[PDB]
Amino acid sequence: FRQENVDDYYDTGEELGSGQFAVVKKCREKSTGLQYAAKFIKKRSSRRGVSREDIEREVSILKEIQHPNVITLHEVYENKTDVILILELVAGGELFDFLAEKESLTEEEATEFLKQILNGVYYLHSLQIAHFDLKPENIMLLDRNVPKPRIKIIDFGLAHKIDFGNEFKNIFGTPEFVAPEIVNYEPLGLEADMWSIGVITYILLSGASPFLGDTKQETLANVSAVNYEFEDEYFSNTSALAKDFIRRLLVKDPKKRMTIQDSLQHPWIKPKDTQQALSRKASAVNMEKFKKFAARSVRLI
Ligand SMILES: [Mg+2]
């Protein structure tokens, strides 16, 4: 990690964000004039700060990843109190906020945006990296003011390189979005991201959250038992192909769940014939419900 003062290389401005042991400022690199985001992460052994091990794992994954749909790490600095990630400036806001500004969305147009999400995940999974926190607030746009906005997956704070010879178990993430193996403290791997893609998709089409209960206890029980329905109220204009794609992801047994590669060949994403393309063209997002959803931190432990 770079030992120089980040201020010698960057001018820093306004706060873009803050979470528990971090703050994000917009910054401009002095030698090039280009803008980035600088995330200052408080170093911890002490119940304040992020552990060295977690900081290093997240940085080691960011340094590896280079793909148009995943946020890029520029440089990393360190002083006595922080680690500072200089990151690509991802300034278009959340995908669902952007989609909720539109009047309508066919299933065909929704798959367009989903496909960029699938391609970023396809790349991560091909490097044996599980993201482990896929949910709408981690799916952003690079710049909303262009003909075809680019999706960026962000926030690799929970990402792990999958180790063939050693099971990984942990309890983390947001209850609405975590796979049953996370709720049951079972072996975790790439499949958990696939389940969360199923949840993002179900919400994208309906504006409803599939497993959400009135309490945290109920949500977790719903997740663990895979207890969800496609209610007519929300899903009466959704194609059978959509619902099949979701059904193939929201699967208790991780070995039976569709993989990223399968997902990208699914006929709802890649129709094999005219009939399938027409079925997709005839269905559309429940935009009135989806707008309420977009207009509405939360942790497993
Ligand atoms: Mg986030």
Short mmCIF file of C-alpha atoms and ligand atoms in Angstrom, two decimals:
data_model
loop_
_atom_site.label_atom_id
_atom_site.label_comp_id
_atom_site.label_asym_id
_atom_site.label_seq_id
_atom_site.Cartn_x
_atom_site.Cartn_y
_atom_site.Cartn_z
CA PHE A 1 0.00 0.00 0.00
CA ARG A 2 1.34 3.47 -0.83
CA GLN A 3 2.99 5.17 2.15
CA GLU A 4 2.71 8.79 0.85
CA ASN A 5 0.27 11.36 1.92
CA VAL A 6 -2.77 11.05 -0.46
CA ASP A 7 -3.08 14.88 -0.34
CA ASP A 8 0.25 15.14 -2.17
CA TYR A 9 -1.39 13.39 -5.20
CA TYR A 10 -5.09 14.26 -4.95
CA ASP A 11 -7.23 17.26 -4.17
CA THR A 12 -10.29 16.02 -2.21
CA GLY A 13 -13.75 17.52 -2.07
CA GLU A 14 -17.19 16.53 -0.93
CA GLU A 15 -18.49 13.57 0.87
CA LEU A 16 -20.14 11.04 -1.42
CA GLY A 17 -20.92 8.61 1.36
CA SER A 18 -20.24 7.12 4.73
CA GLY A 19 -20.76 3.76 6.43
CA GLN A 20 -19.59 2.40 9.71
CA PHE A 21 -15.75 2.75 9.60
CA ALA A 22 -15.44 4.57 6.26
CA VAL A 23 -15.98 7.84 4.47
CA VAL A 24 -15.94 8.46 0.66
CA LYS A 25 -14.84 11.79 -0.90
CA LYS A 26 -14.72 12.85 -4.51
CA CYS A 27 -11.07 13.53 -5.49
CA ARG A 28 -9.12 14.71 -8.50
CA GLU A 29 -5.73 13.25 -9.31
CA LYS A 30 -3.29 16.09 -9.69
CA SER A 31 -1.00 14.64 -12.40
CA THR A 32 -3.85 13.82 -14.81
CA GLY A 33 -6.74 15.93 -13.82
CA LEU A 34 -9.06 12.93 -13.68
CA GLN A 35 -11.66 12.41 -11.02
CA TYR A 36 -11.95 9.38 -8.72
CA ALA A 37 -13.56 8.51 -5.39
CA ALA A 38 -11.34 8.13 -2.27
CA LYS A 39 -12.66 5.76 0.39
CA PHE A 40 -10.97 6.19 3.81
CA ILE A 41 -11.30 2.97 5.89
CA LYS A 42 -10.48 3.16 9.58
CA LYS A 43 -7.85 0.61 10.69
CA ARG A 44 -8.70 -1.34 13.81
CA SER A 45 -7.29 -5.23 17.75
CA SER A 46 -10.26 -3.04 18.79
CA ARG A 47 -14.10 -3.09 18.29
CA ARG A 48 -13.72 0.13 16.21
CA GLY A 49 -12.10 -0.08 12.71
CA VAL A 50 -11.84 -2.79 10.04
CA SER A 51 -9.53 -5.73 10.65
CA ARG A 52 -6.29 -5.92 8.63
CA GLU A 53 -7.30 -9.32 7.26
CA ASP A 54 -10.64 -7.99 5.83
CA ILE A 55 -9.02 -4.86 4.34
CA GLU A 56 -6.34 -6.92 2.65
CA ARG A 57 -8.81 -9.55 1.33
CA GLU A 58 -11.03 -6.77 -0.18
CA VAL A 59 -8.03 -4.96 -1.71
CA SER A 60 -6.51 -8.17 -3.05
CA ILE A 61 -9.82 -8.96 -4.88
CA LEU A 62 -10.22 -5.38 -6.21
CA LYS A 63 -6.65 -5.35 -7.57
CA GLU A 64 -7.44 -8.56 -9.50
CA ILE A 65 -10.66 -7.50 -11.16
CA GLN A 66 -10.66 -5.68 -14.53
CA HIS A 67 -13.98 -5.65 -16.37
CA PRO A 68 -16.38 -2.94 -17.67
CA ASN A 69 -19.20 -4.03 -15.30
CA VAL A 70 -17.19 -4.03 -12.09
CA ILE A 71 -15.77 -1.02 -10.26
CA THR A 72 -12.08 -0.50 -10.85
CA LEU A 73 -9.52 0.13 -8.11
CA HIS A 74 -6.98 2.87 -9.10
CA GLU A 75 -4.48 3.07 -6.15
CA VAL A 76 -4.30 2.25 -2.45
CA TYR A 77 -2.68 4.47 0.20
CA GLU A 78 -2.11 3.97 3.88
CA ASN A 79 -1.39 6.18 6.83
CA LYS A 80 -1.35 5.61 10.64
CA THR A 81 -5.12 5.59 10.90
CA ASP A 82 -6.64 4.74 7.46
CA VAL A 83 -6.39 2.70 4.38
CA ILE A 84 -7.52 4.74 1.42
CA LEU A 85 -8.82 3.15 -1.77
CA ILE A 86 -8.76 5.43 -4.79
CA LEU A 87 -11.64 3.99 -6.80
CA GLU A 88 -13.34 4.62 -10.09
CA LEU A 89 -15.89 7.41 -9.67
CA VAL A 90 -19.25 5.71 -10.18
CA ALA A 91 -21.61 8.62 -10.30
CA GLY A 92 -24.87 7.54 -12.05
CA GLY A 93 -26.62 6.41 -8.89
CA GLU A 94 -28.50 3.08 -8.23
CA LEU A 95 -29.80 1.13 -11.16
CA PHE A 96 -33.31 0.80 -9.66
CA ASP A 97 -33.51 4.58 -9.09
CA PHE A 98 -32.65 5.16 -12.72
CA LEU A 99 -35.19 2.49 -13.94
CA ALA A 100 -37.93 3.94 -11.67
CA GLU A 101 -37.64 7.32 -13.55
CA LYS A 102 -38.92 5.65 -16.72
CA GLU A 103 -42.62 5.43 -17.68
CA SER A 104 -42.50 1.73 -18.50
CA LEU A 105 -40.10 -1.18 -19.14
CA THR A 106 -40.73 -4.33 -21.28
CA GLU A 107 -39.16 -7.64 -20.05
CA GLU A 108 -37.02 -7.29 -23.16
CA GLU A 109 -35.67 -3.92 -21.98
CA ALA A 110 -35.20 -5.13 -18.35
CA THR A 111 -33.09 -8.12 -19.58
CA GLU A 112 -30.83 -5.59 -21.28
CA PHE A 113 -29.86 -4.13 -17.89
CA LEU A 114 -29.89 -7.49 -16.13
CA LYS A 115 -27.52 -8.83 -18.77
CA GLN A 116 -24.85 -6.34 -17.78
CA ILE A 117 -25.19 -7.50 -14.20
CA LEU A 118 -24.89 -11.10 -15.41
CA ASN A 119 -21.77 -10.30 -17.43
CA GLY A 120 -20.01 -8.67 -14.42
CA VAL A 121 -20.91 -11.71 -12.23
CA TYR A 122 -19.86 -14.09 -15.07
CA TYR A 123 -16.41 -12.48 -15.03
CA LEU A 124 -16.14 -12.64 -11.19
CA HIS A 125 -17.23 -16.26 -11.11
CA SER A 126 -14.85 -17.18 -13.86
CA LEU A 127 -12.06 -15.93 -11.50
CA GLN A 128 -13.67 -17.92 -8.61
CA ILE A 129 -14.68 -14.72 -6.78
CA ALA A 130 -17.97 -14.62 -4.99
CA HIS A 131 -19.31 -11.07 -4.37
CA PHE A 132 -21.58 -12.20 -1.48
CA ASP A 133 -23.44 -8.84 -1.27
CA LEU A 134 -25.41 -8.57 -4.46
CA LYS A 135 -28.47 -6.41 -3.94
CA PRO A 136 -29.93 -3.30 -5.69
CA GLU A 137 -27.95 -0.81 -3.69
CA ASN A 138 -24.71 -2.41 -4.94
CA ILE A 139 -25.73 -2.18 -8.58
CA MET A 140 -24.95 1.38 -9.84
CA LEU A 141 -24.59 3.24 -13.08
CA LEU A 142 -21.27 4.73 -14.20
CA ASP A 143 -22.97 7.79 -15.80
CA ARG A 144 -26.64 8.15 -16.49
CA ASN A 145 -26.19 10.86 -19.15
CA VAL A 146 -25.15 8.74 -22.10
CA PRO A 147 -27.04 6.78 -24.80
CA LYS A 148 -26.33 3.41 -23.11
CA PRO A 149 -25.53 3.59 -19.36
CA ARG A 150 -23.01 1.15 -18.06
CA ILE A 151 -23.83 -0.91 -14.90
CA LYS A 152 -21.07 -1.20 -12.27
CA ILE A 153 -21.20 -3.72 -9.47
CA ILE A 154 -19.67 -2.13 -6.35
CA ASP A 155 -18.80 -2.84 -2.65
CA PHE A 156 -16.52 -5.85 -2.50
CA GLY A 157 -16.36 -5.61 1.34
CA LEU A 158 -17.85 -9.17 1.67
CA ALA A 159 -16.29 -10.73 -1.49
CA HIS A 160 -14.21 -13.97 -1.20
CA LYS A 161 -12.01 -15.99 -3.50
CA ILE A 162 -13.48 -19.47 -3.43
CA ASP A 163 -10.93 -21.99 -2.03
CA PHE A 164 -11.51 -25.49 -3.49
CA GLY A 165 -9.98 -27.36 -0.50
CA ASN A 166 -11.72 -25.43 2.37
CA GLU A 167 -15.26 -24.62 3.09
CA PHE A 168 -16.12 -20.98 3.81
CA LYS A 169 -18.91 -20.26 6.37
CA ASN A 170 -19.97 -16.79 7.75
CA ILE A 171 -23.15 -14.88 8.60
CA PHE A 172 -23.40 -11.52 6.81
CA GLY A 173 -25.45 -9.52 4.28
CA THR A 174 -29.02 -8.27 4.23
CA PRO A 175 -31.75 -10.80 5.20
CA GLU A 176 -34.06 -10.05 2.21
CA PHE A 177 -31.24 -10.88 -0.17
CA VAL A 178 -29.10 -13.66 1.37
CA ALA A 179 -29.29 -17.31 0.13
CA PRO A 180 -30.57 -20.08 2.45
CA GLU A 181 -27.02 -21.43 3.03
CA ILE A 182 -26.11 -18.08 4.60
CA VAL A 183 -29.19 -18.14 6.91
CA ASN A 184 -28.39 -21.82 7.96
CA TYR A 185 -24.62 -21.28 8.44
CA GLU A 186 -23.83 -23.88 5.65
CA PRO A 187 -20.92 -23.98 3.13
CA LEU A 188 -20.94 -20.88 0.88
CA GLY A 189 -19.65 -20.42 -2.64
CA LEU A 190 -20.49 -18.86 -6.05
CA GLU A 191 -24.08 -20.18 -5.82
CA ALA A 192 -25.06 -17.67 -3.18
CA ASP A 193 -24.59 -14.80 -5.75
CA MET A 194 -26.94 -16.69 -8.11
CA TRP A 195 -29.70 -16.83 -5.50
CA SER A 196 -29.33 -13.02 -4.91
CA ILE A 197 -29.60 -12.44 -8.69
CA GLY A 198 -32.87 -14.35 -8.54
CA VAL A 199 -34.09 -12.01 -5.76
CA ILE A 200 -32.95 -8.85 -7.66
CA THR A 201 -34.74 -10.12 -10.73
CA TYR A 202 -38.00 -10.95 -8.94
CA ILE A 203 -38.00 -7.37 -7.54
CA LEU A 204 -37.07 -5.79 -10.88
CA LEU A 205 -40.16 -7.37 -12.52
CA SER A 206 -42.68 -6.88 -9.73
CA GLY A 207 -41.62 -4.30 -7.20
CA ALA A 208 -42.19 -6.97 -4.54
CA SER A 209 -39.66 -8.62 -2.26
CA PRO A 210 -40.07 -12.33 -2.43
CA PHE A 211 -39.14 -13.37 1.08
CA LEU A 212 -39.70 -10.22 3.10
CA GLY A 213 -41.78 -10.91 6.27
CA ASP A 214 -43.13 -8.52 8.90
CA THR A 215 -40.11 -9.26 11.14
CA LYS A 216 -36.57 -10.29 10.63
CA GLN A 217 -37.45 -13.76 12.06
CA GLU A 218 -40.15 -14.32 9.41
CA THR A 219 -37.91 -13.11 6.54
CA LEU A 220 -35.20 -15.57 7.52
CA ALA A 221 -37.68 -18.42 7.91
CA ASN A 222 -39.10 -17.56 4.44
CA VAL A 223 -35.61 -17.59 2.97
CA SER A 224 -34.63 -20.86 4.66
CA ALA A 225 -37.73 -22.76 3.49
CA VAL A 226 -37.72 -21.03 0.07
CA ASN A 227 -41.24 -19.84 0.75
CA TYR A 228 -42.36 -17.31 -1.89
CA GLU A 229 -45.19 -17.04 -4.48
CA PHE A 230 -45.72 -15.11 -7.67
CA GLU A 231 -48.81 -13.20 -6.58
CA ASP A 232 -51.25 -12.34 -9.41
CA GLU A 233 -51.46 -8.80 -8.15
CA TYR A 234 -47.79 -8.23 -8.96
CA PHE A 235 -46.97 -10.82 -11.59
CA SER A 236 -49.99 -11.13 -13.89
CA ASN A 237 -48.09 -9.41 -16.73
CA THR A 238 -44.86 -11.41 -16.25
CA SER A 239 -43.86 -14.08 -18.80
CA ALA A 240 -43.63 -17.78 -18.09
CA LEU A 241 -39.98 -17.47 -19.24
CA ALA A 242 -39.23 -14.80 -16.58
CA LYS A 243 -40.82 -16.86 -13.87
CA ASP A 244 -38.86 -19.95 -14.97
CA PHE A 245 -35.58 -17.97 -14.86
CA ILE A 246 -36.41 -16.88 -11.28
CA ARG A 247 -37.58 -20.32 -10.26
CA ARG A 248 -34.27 -21.80 -11.40
CA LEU A 249 -32.30 -19.39 -9.19
CA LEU A 250 -34.47 -19.43 -6.01
CA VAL A 251 -33.53 -23.10 -5.28
CA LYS A 252 -32.66 -24.37 -1.78
CA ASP A 253 -29.99 -26.88 -2.85
CA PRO A 254 -27.04 -24.86 -4.15
CA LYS A 255 -25.92 -27.63 -6.52
CA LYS A 256 -29.36 -27.54 -8.28
CA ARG A 257 -29.36 -23.73 -8.61
CA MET A 258 -28.64 -22.31 -12.06
CA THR A 259 -25.03 -21.23 -12.46
CA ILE A 260 -23.98 -17.89 -14.02
CA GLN A 261 -23.08 -19.63 -17.30
CA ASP A 262 -26.52 -21.42 -17.44
CA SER A 263 -28.20 -18.06 -16.58
CA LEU A 264 -26.72 -16.33 -19.57
CA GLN A 265 -28.02 -19.20 -21.87
CA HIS A 266 -31.51 -19.16 -20.36
CA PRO A 267 -34.10 -18.40 -23.07
CA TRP A 268 -35.53 -15.44 -21.15
CA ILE A 269 -32.08 -13.80 -21.46
CA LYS A 270 -31.12 -15.27 -24.82
CA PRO A 271 -34.31 -16.41 -26.75
CA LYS A 272 -33.63 -19.28 -29.14
CA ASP A 273 -36.59 -18.68 -31.43
CA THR A 274 -39.21 -16.21 -32.48
CA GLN A 275 -41.86 -17.56 -30.10
CA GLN A 276 -39.69 -17.00 -27.06
CA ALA A 277 -38.72 -13.51 -28.20
CA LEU A 278 -42.45 -12.73 -28.73
CA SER A 279 -43.43 -14.08 -25.26
CA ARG A 280 -40.77 -11.76 -23.76
CA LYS A 281 -41.92 -8.72 -25.87
CA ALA A 282 -45.49 -9.25 -24.72
CA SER A 283 -44.67 -9.03 -20.96
CA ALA A 284 -43.40 -6.00 -18.97
CA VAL A 285 -42.21 -4.78 -15.57
CA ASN A 286 -45.00 -3.93 -13.06
CA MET A 287 -43.90 -0.31 -13.20
CA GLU A 288 -46.40 1.14 -10.78
CA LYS A 289 -45.36 -1.38 -8.06
CA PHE A 290 -41.68 -1.13 -9.00
CA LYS A 291 -41.79 2.66 -8.59
CA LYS A 292 -43.12 2.25 -5.01
CA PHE A 293 -40.34 -0.17 -4.29
CA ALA A 294 -37.70 2.22 -5.59
CA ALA A 295 -39.18 4.95 -3.41
CA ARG A 296 -38.90 3.04 -0.02
CA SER A 297 -27.45 -0.86 6.35
CA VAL A 298 -29.78 -3.84 7.34
CA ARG A 299 -27.67 -6.81 8.58
CA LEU A 300 -27.91 -10.53 9.43
CA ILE A 301 -25.87 -10.18 12.63
MG MG B 1 -23.19 -0.96 -0.77
#
